[PDB]
Amino acid sequence: SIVGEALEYVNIGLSHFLALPLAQRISLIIIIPFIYNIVWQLLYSLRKDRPPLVFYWIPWVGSAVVYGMKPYEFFEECQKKYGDIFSFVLLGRVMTVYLGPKGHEFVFNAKLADVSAEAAYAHLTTPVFGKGVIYDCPNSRLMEQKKFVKGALTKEAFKSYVPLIAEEVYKYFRDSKNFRLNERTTGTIDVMVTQPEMTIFTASRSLLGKEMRAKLDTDFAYLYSDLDKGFTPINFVFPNLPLEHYRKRDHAQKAISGTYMSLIKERRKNNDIQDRDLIDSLMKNSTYKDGVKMTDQEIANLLIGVLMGGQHTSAATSAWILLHLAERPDVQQELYEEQMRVLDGGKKELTYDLLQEMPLLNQTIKETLRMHHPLHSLFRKVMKDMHVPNTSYVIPAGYHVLVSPGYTHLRDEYFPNAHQFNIHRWNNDSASSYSVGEEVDYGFGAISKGVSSPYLPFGGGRHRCIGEHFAYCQLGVLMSIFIRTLKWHYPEGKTVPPPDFTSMVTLPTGPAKIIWEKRNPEQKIGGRH
Ligand code: HEM
Ligand SMILES: O[C@@](Cc1ccccc1Cl)(Cn1cncn1)C1(Cl)CC1
């Protein structure tokens, strides 16, 4: 009765292992984790308290490639095989996806102690925006920062922003090489060139003020480009590897936040604090409820985060609006008639109030956001084991949950003929979003308590967007002027481009070109240039 002999051979086998030729160790270096990964999944599949896990060949990497390149096609296939709740491995992480409205509820309305946004996102945003704000701070601090920013995003502020945004659009039509409407009556543009520029010019002028706008006419503008490059999914995996891309980013954040702090300190020095912009607003209103004041640095960092977030979602969206309308001269025509009726043939100056009397224009924004949600996936890190209602599934702490309202936007069950661009599906329902019942306030205003709406472009719950009305104002003004000034169409045999899902938002694959022409060839834009 000797297992002793077998124990000796374990030890012997171990020493013979360590003495294998390098070619075989390297081999086993790869064979043993590859094999282990596969038997681990098979064992995992037997667990009744876990959602089904998408099978993958490469350890650590997981389904990263197919998810990264075609997330909605990935979800649809998984949904057919497994149903609405399933997990997949992503660059060392386990992601649990809950599709559909119940998914929205599970994640967006999750208890504060159950999940963490900042633990999922801080590595992406903190290097770009700076310390102490958004996700580099406790949730309670984020809630109040959202309250401070929302305090400058009032109806009165929008009434004052509309003519400023309009001035910037007209200036861009007058001065930009992409247009020059006083010199040229037709031309070709890449919308992924023009919309980022139009977006930063309009958002700078209105949210940051004339000083910060004026700086964009200089070499300073290049820092925004640099800071922009740092805003990339690569930050999720390699947040800080010592390359030049990362240094240009870090430098830009310092230079840009330094510029904002210079203005802030100048205004306080001169008692020059009015109600012009978001800077005036945060200077007057940025004291937390425990009495700590945001620092000038944190105020500047919060300005960067707000401008940068709004930059990418808005620019992507007006690009998509232009691209869907380029093959729909019927929609351009209908929008143009609305412009003529609401603005008395163009005799009335556009105001924020008249924007609210443009339902087809607003429905066009609404429908573009349905077909092209800028953020295909939203994430939380699971902090406490979560039971999935009406199942035996438990999502353990350390997992991440993923929700995708943009996926549901594209399902025929909730939006008939979902892959058809049709602004009239929103007839008599042109509001950017609408709360169908009870409300709750997490610290930045009363918002919808339920988050089961199949249309959820602005998310929901404590992390819900506060930029929605600014975006509609900005997009509204911009598109109102595009429509009254130009017609546009595709180059021969071109059509709406497929989305690029790998960038930070779901951009059109470029170059995405349209041909514009002036509705009034002789019309001139005044002002000095
Ligand atoms: C078409 C335009 C936009 C869309 C579709 C959009 C979408 C969203 C979504 C889905 C969220 C929820 C994020 C999550 O749950 O993880 C969000 C949050 C947020 N957005 Fe927007 N957004 C847009 C424009 C803007 C603009 C213009 C601003 C600022 C001016 C802005 C600022 C914010 C802020 C501060 C949050 C809160 C993040 C948090 O609490 O964790 N967004 N947005
Ligand atoms: O939600 C964000 C972050 C985010 C979340 C999910 C996917 C991509 C990004 Cl960039 C993106 N965004 C949402 N609205 C405006 N920007 C921030 Cl920057 C916090 C607000």
Report which protein residue has its CA nearest ligand 2's atom 2. 309
Q: Are 129 and 301 in contact (CB under 8 A)?
A: yes
375 lines ligand 2 (CB under 6 A): yes
CA-proximal residue: ligand 1, atom 38 (nearest):
463
Buried b (16+ CB within 10 A) or exposed e, 390-403: eeebbbeeebbbbb
Experimental approach: X-ray
Residue 216, phi then psi, degrees to nearest 5: -70, -15
Contacts from 437-442 at CB under 8 Å and sequence distance 24+? 442/143
Place of tokens 């159950």: 114
Widest CA span in the chain: 105
Task: Determine the atom of ligand 2 nearest the C-alpha atom of 505.
Answer: 8
CB-based contact 323:508 (threshold 8 Å): yes
Torsion of CA 517, 518, 524, 525, to 10 degrees: -80
Give distance in angstroms: CA of 70 to centre of ligand 1.
Answer: 22
Q: How do 93-98 and 400-403 pair as beta strands?
A: parallel
Residues 72 and 406: beta-carbon distance below 8 Å: yes
Q: Is 78 annotated as a binding residue?
A: no
Distance CA 525, CA 174 (A): 6
Burial (CB count within 10 angstroms: exposed 0-12, middle 13-18, buried 19+), residue 189: buried
Helices within 218-295 (DSSP H only): 221-229, 234-237, 244-269, 278-284
Lookup: tokens for 115: 């999940």
- In this structure, the residue with its CA closest to atom 1 of ligand 2 is 309
Q: Is the peptide bond preceding residue 511 cis, with omega within 30 degrees of 0?
A: yes
Question: Taken in order 221, 222, 227, 231, is the CA torsion positive or negative?
Answer: positive
How do the domains of the chain map onto residue ranges? 122-518
* Ligand 2 center–CA 151 separation, angstroms: 20
3-state secondary structure of 519: coil
Query: SS3 breakdown of the chain: % helix, strand, coil, rounded to 5?
Result: 50, 10, 35
CA 510, distance to chain mean position in Å, is: 18
Helices (H) and strands (E) in the chain, counts: 20, 14
Question: DSSP assignment of 464-478, as one string?
Answer: --S-HHHHHHHHHHH
Please give the C-alpha separations between residue 174 and each of 165, 194, 401, 485, in angstroms, as whole numbers: 14, 13, 47, 12
Q: Measure CA 71 to chain center.
A: 15
- Under CATH, to which class is 122-518 assigned? mainly alpha
Rg (CA), the chain: 26
